[PDB]
Symmetry: D2
Subunit: 144 residues, 4 copies
């Protein structure tokens, strides 16, 4: 099963927004985003009260980039999203260079890039395990 | 890189709703659904006008079951979702069980059940190809 | 990155032979098997001394079925081969059978049948882990 | 199923040997290689006659690197082995090199390195398809 959960990088404000709801037209294009809402009212006469939101008509270039949760967690229990960048949590002693690996989606599955292992919960936790160190938007220096 | 697209089975109305937007609390529980909306503003400024929707306030148990698109298509160009049931498009073997393969997501990937080939667009189309024949909600006693 | 290792089911003796070397002719059909050999040279002129072997000419039906090692081990350190049958080793909660999963190779990977998980070392060992309980030849009626 | 088929790179002579039979002890060390054999003698009384061969006796380090067939074919029907390098057979354009990926085995599967696609027969052949254009031993600068 996979519970749909999304975060958005606001490229104009340079801010990561958690728990957002992307809204699409019937043609697979994002047209709005709800960043906060609450449900109000009584049983049978309830409503969705949108607190904060934005739409593509407000912008020449809509500044939100959406990323979905993989439903997997890292060694410290942090939920892994598309765009996260992970590293093997090696001991400090005899420290040796390690590469970082970005999470992406293709061909029906989430992949970590440049790694021989299959991306799955057991591989994330195996031996010393993997940790999310940042993401491609906030931390592009991790892949330099 | 997967464009999010969802459908919902409404267990109360016994119907499939297309192009829905599920709304979750910050704790993994679905608390509302938007089934139609428009953007309007002339300028309003622009606003989201919810057309049809439901919330968990309205129910003892929220009757909507959400399914996400894999973004892959079957041999007939049908978009494949979680809960779809696929079969290989071969001749029909009369009076014997036909193998059926439910689509689900787990542990980082979508997969089809009971099949040695890996679920991916090229394998869906290879040879005679696979077709969606229905899903586990609209067609409950097939599997 | 995969050490070639083979075992053979002897369908005449009904025994499993370990560390065998299958030999294939130019038609890619198995023609012989080496079950024991030594290297006895002296010292810049070495030789392969085959000590135990068999060939398709010594039989009407060559009674050997070859299975290759996956290179992976089960939770008890047992090397896993094609044709093995694995179970998840959760405690016996009184009176229910563990589901069984045969190992095969196809289309680029070794895999376990009827399972949502990727067949890889970490999944084999995760939590209670998986154990080999038999194989399709020694235990033809297990599945 | 997979018919075991092996090739070996002789790293002393710098030659690829086709269709070899690798011989291992029980500790997983290759100690011999049969490059040619035939079966001889009376039915019921037959023998393996070893033609070309080599053993680890003659060597400080046995100079042969074994690679197994994946069982999969490229767009030209060529059997793909570990160590092969594949390219996507898109129309070639001036001064643009097509991207290359090495075949490896790890942890239960064969795969193409640095490519987020399931390595399977239908993906090898899909759309423009992939072709074997060398291997890491005979063409050690090819990946660059």
């Amino acid at each position: 099963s996979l519970i749909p959960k999304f975060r958005a990088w606001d490229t104009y404000e340079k801010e990561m927004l958690e728990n957002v709801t992307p809204l699409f037209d019937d043609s697979n294009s994002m047209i709005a985003i709800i960043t906060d809402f609450q449900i109000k009212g009584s049983p049978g006469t309830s409503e969705i009260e949108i607190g904060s939101y934005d739409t593509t008509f407000n912008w020449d270039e809509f500044p939100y980039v959406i990323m979905q949760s993989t439903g997997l967690k890292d060694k410290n229990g942090v939920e892994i999203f598309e765009g996260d960048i992970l590293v093997y949590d090696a001991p400090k002693k005899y420290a040796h260079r390690r590469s970082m690996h970005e999470i992406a989606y293709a061909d029906g599955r989430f992949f970590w890039e440049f790694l021989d292992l299959v991306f799955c919960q057991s591989n994330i936790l195996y031996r010393d395990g993997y940790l999310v160190i940042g993401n491609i938007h906030e931390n592009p220096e991790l892949l330099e």
